[PDB]
Amino acid sequence: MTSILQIALLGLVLVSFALVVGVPVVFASPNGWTENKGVVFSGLSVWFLLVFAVGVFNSFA
Amino acid sequence: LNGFNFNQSVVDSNGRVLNTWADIINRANLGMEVMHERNAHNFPLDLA
Amino acid sequence: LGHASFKDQEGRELFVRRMPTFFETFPVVLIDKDGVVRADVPFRKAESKYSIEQVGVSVTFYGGELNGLTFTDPSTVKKYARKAQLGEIFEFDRSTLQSDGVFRSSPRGWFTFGHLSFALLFFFGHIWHGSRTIFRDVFAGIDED
Amino acid sequence: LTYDELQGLTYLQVKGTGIANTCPVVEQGTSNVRELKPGDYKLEKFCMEPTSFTVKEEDAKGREEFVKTKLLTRLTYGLDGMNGSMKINNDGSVEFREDEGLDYAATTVKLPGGEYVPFLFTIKEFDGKGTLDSFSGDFLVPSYRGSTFLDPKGRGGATGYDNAIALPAKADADEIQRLNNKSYTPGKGSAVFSVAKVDTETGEIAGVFESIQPSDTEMGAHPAKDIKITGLWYGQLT
Amino acid sequence: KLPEAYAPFSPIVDVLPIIPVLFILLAFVWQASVSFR
Amino acid sequence: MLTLKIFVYTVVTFFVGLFIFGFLSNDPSRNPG
Amino acid sequence: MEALVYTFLLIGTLGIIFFSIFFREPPRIA
Amino acid sequence: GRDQETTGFAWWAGNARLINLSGKLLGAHVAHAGLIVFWAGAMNLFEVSHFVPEKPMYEQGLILLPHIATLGYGVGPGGEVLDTFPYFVSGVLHLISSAVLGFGGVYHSLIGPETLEESYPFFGYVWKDKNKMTNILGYHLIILGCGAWLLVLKALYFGGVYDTWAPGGGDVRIISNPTTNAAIIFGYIVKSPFGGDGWIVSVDNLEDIIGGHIWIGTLCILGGIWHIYTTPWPWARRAFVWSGEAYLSYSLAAVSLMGFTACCFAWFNNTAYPSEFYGPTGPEASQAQAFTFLVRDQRLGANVASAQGPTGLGKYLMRSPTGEIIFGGETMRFWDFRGPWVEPLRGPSGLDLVKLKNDIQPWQERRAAEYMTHAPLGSLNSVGGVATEINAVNFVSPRSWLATSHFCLGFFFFVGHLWHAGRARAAAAGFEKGIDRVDEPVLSMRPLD
Amino acid sequence: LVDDRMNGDGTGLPFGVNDGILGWVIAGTLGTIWAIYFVSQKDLG
Amino acid sequence: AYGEGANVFGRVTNKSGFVPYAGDSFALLLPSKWNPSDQKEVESIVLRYEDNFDAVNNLYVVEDKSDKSSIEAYGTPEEFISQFGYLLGKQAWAGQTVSEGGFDANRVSNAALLGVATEKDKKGKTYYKFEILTRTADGNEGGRHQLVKATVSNGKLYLLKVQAGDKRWFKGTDKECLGVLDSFTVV
Amino acid sequence: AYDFVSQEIRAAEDPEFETFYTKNILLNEGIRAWMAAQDQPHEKLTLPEEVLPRGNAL
Amino acid sequence: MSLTLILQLVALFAVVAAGPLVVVLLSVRGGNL
Ligand code: CLA
Ligand code: CLA
Ligand code: CLA
Ligand code: CLA
Ligand SMILES: CC1=C(/C=C/C(C)=C/C=C/C(C)=C/C=C/C=C(C)/C=C/C=C(C)/C=C/C2=C(C)CCCC2(C)C)C(C)(C)CCC1
Ligand SMILES: CC1=C(/C=C/C(C)=C/C=C/C(C)=C/C=C/C=C(C)/C=C/C=C(C)/C=C/C2=C(C)CCCC2(C)C)C(C)(C)CCC1
Ligand SMILES: CC1=C(/C=C/C(C)=C/C=C/C(C)=C/C=C/C=C(C)/C=C/C=C(C)/C=C/C2=C(C)CCCC2(C)C)C(C)(C)CCC1
Ligand SMILES: [Cl-]
Ligand SMILES: [Cl-]
Ligand code: NA
């Protein structure tokens, strides 16, 4: 499960890149937040899911 | 914490130390160090 | 006093290193003809390496007051080497003028110092009095721009 | 504070109170000193504590009198931890000897008119003799300053200058005493000890002592002054 | 060192600590973007 | 030396108390504004 | 005697400071 | 954002535009808190990635790992690192929490309400509503008290913390019977700050530390409740200035004092900052050098007790001004040093001559030598030793880094007390922008001062 | 012992109060200044 | 050469810290940071190098004719090292002193023999090896460590002596001194 | 303005008179001795370590 | 040249460009800065 943990961690790093570079853009954009609530919610949810997956994979192996 | 210590920072191809103005400053510092308190030191390192 | 020639117990002639003009105090070192230090008056008498007693240095004076006189006791040899680091050794009568024992400067040194300081101050004089010359109209005040 | 009372206290209960400099005092002994059992004893835990310092001074009329002084070096004048031998004889004869321990202390009293008198209060190699009521003897007094000590201008024995280099034209016989005459010759002092109390069961003794030793000669620069030191001493036998 | 699973991600960890000093520079960049309004 | 110590303690306490209770006595209202 | 001269010079400087503080010429407005 | 025309503050004082914008101020403070946690996590990960457990922690320039190790978490007897995993866990946790806090700061700074007074009355302070400000102080005071009790619980029922005074080389001990005596605990604060006393820096037991944190946690919770349920007294209203900048200035003064205290704690104390992780102190290194040379010359025959130095004062041993036997030389200035490796050699009257002859154990000698070779002396470019060295060793003691950095921070925050406090006073009075130019106070005063 | 000393240096004495007279004079001076302030100004709490 | 070119993106020559040296009949490795020295305290010194920073750290090789057929003809190694008592300097001070700790009466310097032994060689050559610690009343640099390696070949005695301050010895000069002592090889 | 001759003479006559000025003179002496050899190569000063002024155990 | 060095440089460039990139995107988009 070491390889699985590593690819999950890379996915988490990529999702964090996306969130860091997008959340300020969505927030400061005019009317951007209202039309992008779902996208940001999906991003945060998958980010937290990846965090917990990395945690459980670390626990396993 | 002290200042920069570039003593013997420049060495040649074979490893010989090439002196710099920092080395002359260090020579003067050594001159001051071995004389500042003639009788107060019983051990080689000041540390105080 | 004469000229002091220092010779070790081997017979190798030793020369005392003269004090450079920069040094108020200079350590005593007796040097071989080939520039190899052969004796000195060490600062640390413990485990000394080139001590006068260890090397056995004797001083013979040629000419002057002490002519053909040889001294071998280490105290006298140390004293005369310390004197010879200053150049030729002379006898001085210090009781007459109550000499303190620190070198003064010759009249050429005092002349040079005084007239150099005057030269600097008069460079400032050139600057000041010439600025006053060129700016005479405005040195009573300025009418804004 | 007897030996046990001092020993029970911890460092944190003693640091800062000045108790350390005090020597222990026997408390439940007997003043009858003749009752001590004769024999040879390894005298250890030997300590000395002065109670006064007086400096000899000779006046215009020649009346050499001892003048009281004021101490300057705080509570750094107690000798302790010394070891030695002692032979109590049947008639009371005593062969006292001191070998090791903190048997010297550099102190500096001040004389009226403002005179700083330093000296090594020491009992080094005190080979005493006499009766059990009072035994006297001589002890070594080392030079106050070691050979490697440098004077304010760098002069000194061993490591030093042997010359007043600040005067490149004055190193003559007018300064023979100050230059190269750094005489570190040890002197001698006289001491007298009287036993006051003895605890036979503990095997410890305590009493009074009086000593006379020269002051600091400052490496032979000026003559030594006689120092009289009275105090109380303690020790343990075997 | 890091546990053997996280060994390949060592460069990211070696780069991370300098971000806080990047935030103040980002604030200066943002102010410059608005002509220091 | 005890008398000197108690005297200095009294002096220091007096001055420090003056400071503390002077800065409390409605100081912020002592401005021209 | 040198100590006497030094003390006199220091006392003179301090007295000059005292006079320049408490006996200054008033700053005349306009 | 804002502009200078509508606010009166230029860009180089732009955060001053947030004084009366409660929501954006909350966002800014949350963002800076996220920054603090992010540095904590990232630097912890950096340290563990660059850490080799074979070498001592202070050899490798680590500041956070000693902090974690002092709380237990993977250290064996003598301060030996067993598991580096807890350090990694701490780094990851602080880092992820920092990500959350950064998102929160961004939200409350960009999209959240600019002013919270209307929509969220519970968070709508006014910088002069004394009751509300005391309520906020009480909430955060309760949080601080809970943190102190958290430390107490860690030391009591969760494996204890690293006692460097434990017999041997020190070990992780569970502190039982904390010092809960009022006289002992409060005697530290009224203790002198000079030598031999050291104020609170001279705390030496773990029991004293745990009892003190017990008292501080309980008092902080009680004071939080008190400041929640009460309004400042009428005398308190007149004594203080009531504005946001005034509160900032008070906090600046407090944390400058705390920074100076932390600098001195890191430099002097070795109980809460064990030398196994932070390295020896200055006094510790000096005493270690003296001890090492004493044992070396004592092994080579000789009698250190009677050995007289060049000054005639004692080459190895002498008497402290109070009378306690102490190491000779310059290290006599550090006679009040106390360490785990030197206390066994101290009798009632200080260093014991008998114990110094035969009671010395080899581990003490090894630790003393190691401390002597790693004295807290270094250069700016991390070159170990005195200023006159050969530029061969790469070492500056973590104690030196902590002391220097937090002293600089303490001084600058004292200057902050000065600046922000003077400005608060002037703004309250009305002089913040300058003299009136129509009614100067000076023109209403008699001449000649 | 050749003289008398305070023997207080290097001790955890509160405010340096080795003897109660010092604490009493400290309390008296502070309380007197406080009484002056209280009877002049208004302290209530 | 003038057109040789720089060493951009190149490789170092050596980082061992020791450089070879070939004598009249001996081979040696000297520290890179140590400079050649001119002074000859003993007229029979044929080689000398000194540390750039602390001149107390130095070494010199002495080659002088010997009547003894082999180094073993001197006798025991301790007897041999007792023969060369002048290599530890001379106490020029001659004053009666007892106020120095750890030293006998009227003495300001003391040499302690930490250990002696005999070594071998690729050709079976025997070398006398000595380690000494010299302390002084002023305690200069906390004493001085002296390493001596002596051999007799072709009617000549070769003696290498390395001196290091204890202050320098504690902080890494021991490696350099031991390397110098090990590398000393004679035919 | 290297020296005050009165203080030098007093120190020479009195081996226990010390001021910060004399300590500064000693420091200057150390600086000169330990810097001359490498600061002024043209002098070719091969001073043995036993002639360099030095304190105790330093 | 080193793989760790290559990854370090890549991560450094990414994190450095992250801030100016979002600033530029908000400027071109018209977001309130
Ligand atoms: C950590 C320090 C810090 C913090 C927390 C703040 C916070 C704040 N500042 Mg400020 N500022 C700072 C430092 C700081 N500043 C410094 C050093 C200066 C001197 C140059 C200034 C000068 C300044 C001025 C002149 C002004 C502010 C203003 C503001 C407020 C409005 C921000 C805004 O909407 O702008 C716009 C926001 C953007 C352009 C978006 C770009 C930046 C975002 C936050 C991206 C962050 C990147 C990050 C990785 C995102 C992580 C996402 C997460 C999910 C992981 C805000 C609460 C304004 C104010 O007064 O409020 C009314 C104002 O005018 N500041
Ligand atoms: C950092 C947390 C904190 C803060 C910011 C405040 C702030 C405040 N408190 Mg509060 N308090 C706190 C914690 C805190 N308190 C705790 C934990 C408790 C429980 C014990 C209390 C109990 C308390 C009470 C009972 C009262 C206050 C009051 C006040 C207000 C008046 C302040 C004052 O009297 O001026 C300054 C204070 C003084 C000049 C007196 C100093 C007293 C201390 C103990 C001196 C100790 C000196 C000692 C030698 C240590 C010196 C070392 C030092 C240099 C570090 C003020 C806004 C008063 C109030 O307004 O009622 C609401 C009030 O009656 N507080
Ligand atoms: C560049 C900014 C900067 C940086 C990088 C640091 C960094 C550091 N500071 Mg510093 N500081 C700064 C600015 C900075 N500071 C400023 C501006 C000031 C004001 C002048 C201070 C004042 C200051 C003080 C007073 C102290 C530090 C300290 C420290 C060190 C420890 C940090 C810490 O743990 O804090 C504190 C951590 C918290 C507040 C959160 C703790 C929350 C709980 C209680 C943790 C408990 C965990 C628990 C036991 C585990 C769970 C157990 C459970 C299972 C039961 C650290 C290396 C400390 C130090 O080491 O002294 C040298 C110290 O005491 N700093
Ligand atoms: C928690 C502490 C704190 C807080 C919340 C504030 C808050 C505030 N300050 Mg203040 N200040 C503080 C501490 C603090 N300050 C300290 C410690 C000092 C002393 C140095 C000052 C000195 C100060 C001045 C002179 C001014 C303020 C001003 C202000 C207001 C606007 C600040 C701003 O955005 O400017 C913009 C921020 C910047 C331009 C960034 C500055 C860049 C710094 C210098 C970089 C230094 C980093 C360096 C590498 C660290 C090394 C430190 C040391 C280890 C060597 C604001 C409300 C202004 C005001 O008057 O209020 C109306 C103002 O003029 N402050
Ligand atoms: C991967 C991994 C892991 C795991 C991890 C995790 C999963 C973590 C988590 C993390 C988290 C998930 C954290 C949390 C965070 C959050 C935060 C930090 C926030 C808080 C809050 C606040 C701060 C605020 C609050 C409030 C409000 C909002 C309202 C009012 C009131 C108050 C203010 C209170 C492990 C272990 C295996 C290790 C290894 C790696
Ligand atoms: C308001 C504003 C400001 C500020 C801002 C800020 C400061 C924010 C915050 C921010 C932040 C502070 C954020 C955070 C982030 C973080 C994150 C997002 C994390 C992530 C993680 C991950 C992705 C993973 C990792 C890993 C692990 C865990 C394991 C090991 C390895 C690694 C490390 C890889 C400014 C100045 C601009 C100005 C303007 C306004
Ligand atoms: C934890 C722990 C402990 C304990 C500690 C403690 C017990 C603490 C507390 C402390 C404290 C108890 C503190 C307090 C402080 C206070 C203060 C610092 C005050 C100040 C004052 C002020 C700031 C005011 C001012 C003013 C006046 C005077 C006048 C008018 C105006 C005003 C009001 C502003 C120990 C040691 C065991 C160590 C270990 C840890
Ligand atoms: Cl000095
Ligand atoms: Cl020392
Ligand atoms: Na010295």
Kindly report the backbone phi and psi dihedral angles of residue I34, in degrees, each rounded to the nearest multiple of 5, phi listed first.
-65, -40
Tokens of D159: 């490591």
Atom 38 of ligand 1, residue of closest alpha carbon:
L33
Q: What are phi and psi of E15, to 5 degrees?
A: -90, -30
Q: Which atom of ligand 1 is nearest to the CA of A27?
A: 40
Q: Tell me the chain B residues in contact with residue D149 when contact means C-beta distances shorter than 8 Å.
A: 39
Q: How many C-beta atoms surround the C-beta of residue F11 within 10 A?
A: 11
Task: Indicate the residue type of H38.
Answer: F
* Nearest protein Cα to ligand 2, atom 5: H137
Match 């050969």 to its residue by tokens.
H390
Task: Please tell me the residue having the least CA distance from ligand 6 atom 38.
Answer: E27
What determination technique applies here? Answer: cryo-EM
CB I7 within 8 A of CB D18: yes
Residue J171 DSSP label: I
Q: What is the DSSP string of D97-128?
A: EE-SSB-EEEEEEEETTTEEEEEEEE-TT-EE
Residue (of D118, D152, D123, D151) closest to D135 by Cα position: D123
> Could you write out the DSSP letters of every residue in D43-64?
EEEEEEEEEEEEEEEE-TT--E
Please, are residues H314 and H308 in contact by the beta-carbon 8 Å criterion?
A: yes
Note whether L7 contacts E19, CB cutoff 8 Å: no
SS3 B8: coil
Contacts of J166 (CB under 8 A, 6+ apart): B44, J133, J141, J142, J143, J144, J145
Ligand 5 pocket by C-beta < 6 Å: which residues?
A 51-52, 54-55, 58-59; H 89, 92-93, 96-97, 100-101
Which secondary-structure segment (H or E) carries C108?
Answer: helix C107-134
How far is the C-alpha of F24 from the C-alpha of K6, rounded, in Å? Answer: 58
**Helix crossing, A37-60 with A2-28: angle to 10°?**
160
**From start to end of K1-58, where are the E strands?**
none
Rounded to a whole number, what is the distance in Å from the CA of I20 to chain D's nearest CA?
18
Residue H58, marked binder: no
Give the minimum alpha-carbon distance from J56 to chain B in angstroms, rounded to a whole number: 13
Interstrand relation of J58-65 and H161-163 (parallel, antiparallel or unpaired): unpaired
Q: Which one, of H35, D147, K32, lies nearest residue J95 by Cα?
A: D147
Instruction: State whether J17 and B13 contact (CB < 8 Å).
Output: no
- Neighboring chain I residues of D69 at a CB cutoff of 8 Å: none
Q: Give the closest residue to H59 by CA, choosing from H399, H364, H434, H427.
A: H399
In order of A3, A21, H185, the CA distances from A15 in angstroms are 18, 10, 51
H304: tokens are 């250190």
- Cβ neighbours of G7 (radius 10 Å): 10
> Across-strand partners of D139?
D189
K touches F, CB cut-off 8 Å, minimum 3 pairs: no
DSSP C17: P
Residue closest via CA to ligand 7's atom 35 equals: H212
- Identify all chain J residues contacting H309, using CB atoms and an 8 Å cutoff: 101
Q: How far is the CA of C57 from the centre of ligand 9 (A)?
A: 37
Nearest CA in chain D to I11: D16
Helix, coil or strand: residue F12: helix
Annotated binding site of C for chlorophyll a: 128, 132
Q: Which of I35, F16, I45 is nearest to H236 (CA)?
A: I45
CA-wise closest residue to H209 among H151, H146, H266? H151
**B7 vs H389: CB contact, 8 Å cut-off?**
yes
Find which of D148, D179, D213 to mutate to test the J interface (most J CBs within 10 Å of its CB): D148
Counting from 1 in the atom list of ligand 5, the atom nearest the Cα of H33 is: 23
Q: Which amino acid is at C23?
A: F
Where do the domains of chain A lie? 1-61
3-state DSSP assignment of residue F8: helix
- Ligand closest to CA B33: 10
Distance from the alpha carbon of residue H141 to the mean position of ligand 6, in angstroms: 28
Annotated binding residue B37: yes
Half-sphere exposure of J114 (CA within 13 A, CB side): 16
Residue ranges in H230-361 assigned as alpha helix (H): 234-239, 244-268, 275-278, 282-299, 355-358
Spatial CA neighbour of J75 closest among J114, J125, J128, J119: J128
Q: Taking CB atoms and an 8 Å cut-off, how many pairs form between chains D and H?
A: 103
Nearest CB to C51 within list J38, J40, J90 = J90
Contact J88, H301 (CB under 8 A): no
Residues K31 and B31: their CA atoms lie apart, in Å, by 4
**H325, H351 Cβ separation under 8 angstroms:** yes
What's the Cα-to-Cα distance from I31 to each of F12, I21, I28, I35, rounded to whole Å? Answer: 14, 15, 5, 6
Do H155 and H161 form a contact (C-beta atoms < 8 A)? Answer: yes
For chain B, the maximum distance between any two Cα atoms, rounded to a whole number of angstroms, is: 43
Q: How far apart are the first and last CA of chain L?
A: 40
Distant-in-sequence, close-in-space partners of J126: CB < 8 Å, separation ≥ 6:
J70, J71, J72, J118, J119, J120, J151
